[PDB]
Amino acid sequence: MWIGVISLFPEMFKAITEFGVTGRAVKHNLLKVECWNPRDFTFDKHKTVDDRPYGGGPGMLMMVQPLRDAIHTAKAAAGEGAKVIYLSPQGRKLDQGGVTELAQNQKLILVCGRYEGIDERLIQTEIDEEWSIGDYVLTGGELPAMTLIDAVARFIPGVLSFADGLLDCPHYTRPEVLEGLTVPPVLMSGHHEEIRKWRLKQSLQRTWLRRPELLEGLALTDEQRKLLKEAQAEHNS
């Protein structure tokens, strides 16, 4: 997968390109991240990348000309078939369904805003889709871009409970007893099918207790329905 990035702070992307599973994906050429910086497309002495909003108020916007030229250059490098994404709080809120959809693209270009964002007409003329990572306010689009890249990278062949839309079950490792708390005996049992069912029941229980709205979005199998009923009965005992 190839991801173009437009950012005033390309070095921030080292966080995903030099570390962990995404870092491995980049080193092994499974994932390519290529950055263009609007600062390199300025022509004035002081390499100005911001500009004043019409109508005044506080805050600056990204300057149109350097940003537009960086986008054009990215598009030219991507060739045909690249979807241009602007990350913003007015975008579609990212969720796992969204990620799986985004992961179908072989090529993406991600535009990272700073200051109060970008001129609305650039969204109209250059941007295909707008996406948010959540209903909170951040200082720039770079962390959101990295969040998206990380999420989609998991779908790239060779890189590696929300799979079934449920919260994860609890996990245990050594030691057997930790501050008086013991590992559930079923996990020490060796009984593969009992363990599978325990994990599924736990996942259903936690989704019900913590995020019951997520259960309304699922069509549970007969086994899931049984396990949920048993977990609800136990909770009510």
Ligand X SMILES: O=c1[nH]cnc2scc(-c3ccccc3)c12
59 annotated among ligand-binding-site residues: no
138 annotated among ligand-binding-site residues: yes
Distance separating alpha carbons of residues 201 and 45, to the nearest angstrom? 64
Distance separating alpha carbons of residues 219 and 100, to the nearest angstrom? 19
Work out whether 158 is an interface residue with ligand X (CB under 6 A). Answer: no
Closest contact distance (angstroms) between CB of 141 and ligand X is 4
Work out whether 133 is an interface residue with ligand X (CB under 6 A). Answer: yes
φ/ψ of 66, rounded to 5, equals -65, -40
Work out whether 165 is an interface residue with ligand X (CB under 6 A). Answer: no
Closest contact distance (angstroms) between CB of 192 and ligand X is 42
Closest contact distance (angstroms) between CB of 139 and ligand X is 6
Work out whether 66 is an interface residue with ligand X (CB under 6 A). Answer: no
Task: Please give the single-letter amino acid code of residue 161.
Answer: S
CB 59 within 8 A of CB 115: yes
φ/ψ of 107, rounded to 5, equals -135, 130
Closest contact distance (angstroms) between CB of 110 and ligand X is 10
Closer residue to ligand X, CB minimum distance, 118 or 153 = 118
Work out whether 232 is an interface residue with ligand X (CB under 6 A). Answer: no
Beta pairing partners, 32? 2
Strands (E), the chain: 2-6, 32-36, 50-51, 61-62, 83-93, 107-111, 129-132, 177-178, 181-182
φ/ψ of 127, rounded to 5, equals -100, 135
Closer residue to ligand X, CB minimum distance, 61 or 166 = 61
Closer residue to ligand X, CB minimum distance, 36 or 131 = 131
Distance separating alpha carbons of residues 143 and 20, to the nearest angstrom? 16
64 annotated among ligand-binding-site residues: no
Closest Cα to residue 49, out of 5, 112, 131, 124?
112
Counting beta carbons within 10 angstroms of the beta carbon of residue 211, is it exposed (0 to 12), middle (13 to 18) or buried (19 or more)? middle
Work out whether 117 is an interface residue with ligand X (CB under 6 A). Answer: yes
Work out whether 87 is an interface residue with ligand X (CB under 6 A). Answer: yes
Closest contact distance (angstroms) between CB of 90 and ligand X is 9
Interacting stretch for ligand X, rule CB under 6 A, among 2-10, 44-52, 110-118, 180-188? 110-118
Work out whether 43 is an interface residue with ligand X (CB under 6 A). Answer: no
Binding site: residue ranges?
A: 86, 113, 133-138
Binding site for S-adenosyl-L-methionine: residue ranges?
A: 86, 113, 133-138
User: Where do contacts with ligand X occur on this chain (CB under 6 A)?
Assistant: 87-89, 113-114, 117, 132-134, 136-141, 144
